[PDB]
């Protein structure tokens, strides 16, 4: 019982590692993007401001 | 002596918890049943002796047949209530009221006539110099040592929840829900008859109850175990009856504690133990759930079931925001934290003066209860 | 032994998954961060096109 | 036919009053509840029917579990509120929407959503020429026939409080305050537990609604009735329950809604019925004041018990300045304002060129809502 | 010691800002609430403690009703006042004010009673050797280090607008305005309810206090702000409430602070803020408008919203003649200027000989606040 718990929290912690590590390069994608659109948006910055 | 001592008896449905108060555990804890012979004896020199209270009614239980004088956190019987007080004083803790200040507990929600009729019994059955009642609830509360939390009570008389914050409480907020240790027995022994065993009777009731005091375990997912039951292998468990008869329960053990999750397979619509939850938490204020959520605490009998806390945890964790953590405090010793929470209080200084005296009410009546406590 | 080792695979895997949530969790303060830039930027960006 | 008619529909929680136009009494009124069937049946040859609206759940009650889909003047479900208007227009009306004009009542201070989606349901599912949405407080004005008042409206829905002077509206004087009838129909039940009256589920919650509309009534001094309720007499009633089980009730009774005046019983900081009708005033600019005073409307469900008007022209009086006379209309058929208001509304000539018409919405769609009308 | 330094408090509305003249900054400070326990606690060895004053009432928030003790620059309530100092200099300065002159600042137009009762508090309840009150808005001017301008003042009190001219002062030129931070956070949680999001109670009405802290803005322009809310991006601002609630934010945002430029919405014809500026200037002699128009300094807690400065300098320069040039000089810091310009008035020589002292009260009585002072 504390086995098929264990496990069960195993596959759920696996899977909660799979998908904070989903989240991790879902939102590793999502900070590149925003600091690519950043770095644009400060580029487009510097073109509005000159 | 200084400060007299205190007396504290526990009274939901099922089991007198009693003892000093001052000290960590209760003396006597034994069930809250008064047997009565059914059978007509043919000897001389038996008993007689009307009726059988206590543990030794347990002990000779096939004459008898067995009343529970508290049904629902409700006093059926009024006689048979001040007969298991008898026995609690005289047989176990061999005490005079009359030298003793008596805490009793008692059940949220409950009909103003129990508080009231349990004051004028104490006051002018057993001569006694003041008692207070006190709600189940915030003597668990104390117990664990926590000034805020959300207290699922359940007993073998009714379940109760009754959230606190840095002391206070929330009337409007207080949810009692009719499910108990003693639905679950009769659900129980109605789910064995399923594989042949048949337990018609008050006395091997009782057998089933003990059944499912240890054999009973609560799914940390339902379906998931019950699929795993088509493989039987570690979800049947033997078990010895009194008779020498052997009895063999797959299944059939852990759906018996799913009901309080499943009120559907009892029959009654109300919502399950941590939808009960929910709707107390709901119905608190906006800025103090965050510390309910993390501070729910676990008290009495029929939350002793392994795998409780976990059931609980990944349902209000489910239907709750995952921006805040849910942690559940289930102590161990949940069984008796009642007990220890009215022993805190008699021990506590400044409760001493918040005793209801018995001049207070010789001169205002037994309807003070509701006016001086709540 | 197969409960110890789904514990020490689920501190392990729940590891995994605090350790990705502490790299999502540092992603979603940079999102948080370099978004709030991104558009701050693209405000500062509307401010010098208007 | 000149005109074609209109139909009129009034569906704040607890009870659907519908019917044509310019008819001064409804075609249909029956409770806005949608009842499933919680217990599987085994028999051959019933129904099945996924749902019972209306009376019929009302009838076949104990089967079943009951669900109000309006909560808080808010729709919590939507094919349960379809089945509602698809009931009342061919069980008891008996017509086509595309031959009528349909009015909808609805609440002050109600999310958005609600008007969008109401307007989408009756373009899309029941094909509709044209319809309105009316704020309800303004259509009870319309009904007393005045041009001036403050409108205190309550249903089993919530309390809406509306002033409005010469026609026109103040929208920073519009008061919503979330009591309603129905949270007096669970302090009800709530309170019968202190006299030991167990109500737990659905169908007995609207036995107590039963009790509340024609048992209760609101105490013209508080203290002073809960004062001679010592001597119990004419302030305990019998009551017979459906079951053959009778229930004695007393003070409990006019407790009940006194609620609406202490909203402390219900554990809510928001101030009472008396109270948010002077902070609706107090936002009124000056000069109007005196005639809003004079010209307080009482509409809805939970504005029917005796002594309301009496106590709000004791308590309005008390706070106001007594310089000028506090006077409260409070009629008899005050249930049906919203609906009587109506009726006439979709009377008026110079309203049949305001309606949103069918196709308005189709080159416009559902947000010309609050592009159109309140 | 020498000077004795003096002390220094700021109650506008809101916030108590307070300190030690002769410092930048102030030590001291907190929002001006006294909040009581509105639900009766049931715990023993909780407090009592009456009522909690200062940010310990923000800690505790959702027990209390909160009280704002000061509307509209106006003490409604004395003793919560009294209770606010005495928190002031007791819990946070820690000072006997025996041992240090005070000022109190104190808004324009604003009736005798508040300025000669809270002299009166100051000499006979914290027995004090001397006190000076002052306007709001000439403290703000000396913190800005500039002899002349036209001081917006705008706290969460009531708006205020000052003209000065190398020192001197127009009396007739001075302008009060009903609008304040308070009356926009009361129009936010009405403007918040046709997104769904129901904020009704004293609690959490300073959460959309807090929101509106950081997230509202100043619209450039506000119906081309209002037109690109068609395509919401960067107008919606996702807020995480205490409860663990998100809030989603869109146009909503910017039209509470456009209140103060458009007091239609709130319902008073009462002129916006920068039309209330050209009645003040326009108030004034020919000659000095000039450098009026190029001074204008805004102080106070609700002239901290991003873009407000940009905007009246927009409506400002489009009004009056572009003949001259419209600088506003508003700085960051400038909610804590009113504090600034008493802390620097109390450090300057010349002011020692002008405080009202402890003497000439005992002597001449509470009336001579406005013989001495302005």
Redesign the interface.
């Known amino acids: 019982?504390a086995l098929?718990?264990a496990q069960?929290k195993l596959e759920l912690a696996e899977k909660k590692a799979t998908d904070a590590e989903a989240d991790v390069a879902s939102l590793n994608r999502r900070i590149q993007l925003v600091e690519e659109e950043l770095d644009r948006a400060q580029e487009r910055l510097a073109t509005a401001l000159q | 002596e200084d400060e007299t001592t205190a007396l504290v008896c526990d009274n939901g449905s099922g089991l007198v918890k009693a003892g000093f108060a001052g000290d960590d555990a209760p003396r006597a804890v034994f069930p809250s049943i008064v047997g009565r012979p059914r059978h007509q004896g043919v000897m001389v020199g038996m008993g007689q002796k009307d009726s059988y209270v206590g543990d030794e009614a347990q002990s000779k239980r096939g004459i008898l047949t067995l009343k529970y004088p508290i049904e629902?956190g409700?006093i059926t019987n009024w006689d048979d209530m001040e007969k298991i007080w008898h026995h609690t004083f005289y047989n176990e803790l061999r005490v005079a009221p009359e030298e003793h200040p008596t805490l009793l507990t008692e059940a949220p929600?409950?009909?103003?006539?129990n508080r009231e009729k349990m004051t004028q019994i104490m006051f002018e059955t057993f001569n006694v110099p003041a008692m207070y009642v006190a709600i189940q609830a915030?003597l668990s509360l104390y117990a664990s040592g926590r000034?805020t939390g959300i207290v699922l009570d359940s007993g073998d008389g009714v379940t109760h929840n009754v959230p606190?914050?840095?002391?206070?409480?929330?009337?409007?907020?207080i949810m009692?829900l009719?499910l108990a240790g003693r639905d679950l027995t009769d659900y129980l022994m109605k789910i064995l008859t399923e594989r042949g065993y048949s337990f018609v009777t008050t006395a091997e009731r009782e057998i089933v109850r003990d059944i499912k005091e240890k054999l009973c375990?609560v799914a940390?997912?339902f379906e998931?175990e019950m699929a795993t039951a088509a493989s039987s292998s570690?979800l049947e468990k033997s078990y010895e009856l009194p008779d020498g008869q052997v009895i063999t329960i797959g299944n059939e053990r852990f759906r018996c504690p799913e009901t309080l999750f499943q009120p559907?397979f009892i029959?009654?619509?109300?919502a399950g133990i941590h939808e009960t939850t929910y709707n107390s938490i709901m119905?608190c204020?906006?800025?103090?759930?965050?510390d309910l959520y993390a501070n729910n605490v676990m008290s009495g009998g029929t939350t002793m079931y392994?795998?409780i806390a976990?059931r609980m945890q990944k349902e209000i964790t489910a239907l709750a925001?995952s921006?805040?953590k849910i942690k559940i405090i289930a102590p161990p010793e949940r069984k008796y934290s009642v007990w220890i929470g009215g022993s805190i209080?008699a021990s506590?200084s400044?409760?001493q003066q918040?005793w209801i005296t018995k001049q207070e009410y010789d001169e205002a009546g037994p309807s003070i209860v509701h006016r001086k406590c709540?």
């Open positions: 019982e098929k718990d069960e | 629902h409700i929600l409950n009909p103003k006539a915030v000034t606190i914050y840095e002391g206070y409480a929330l009337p409007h907020a009692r009719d375990y940390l997912d998931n570690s559907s029959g009654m619509e109300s119905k204020d906006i800025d103090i759930r965050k392994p795998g976990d925001p921006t805040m209080l506590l400044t409760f918040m709540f």
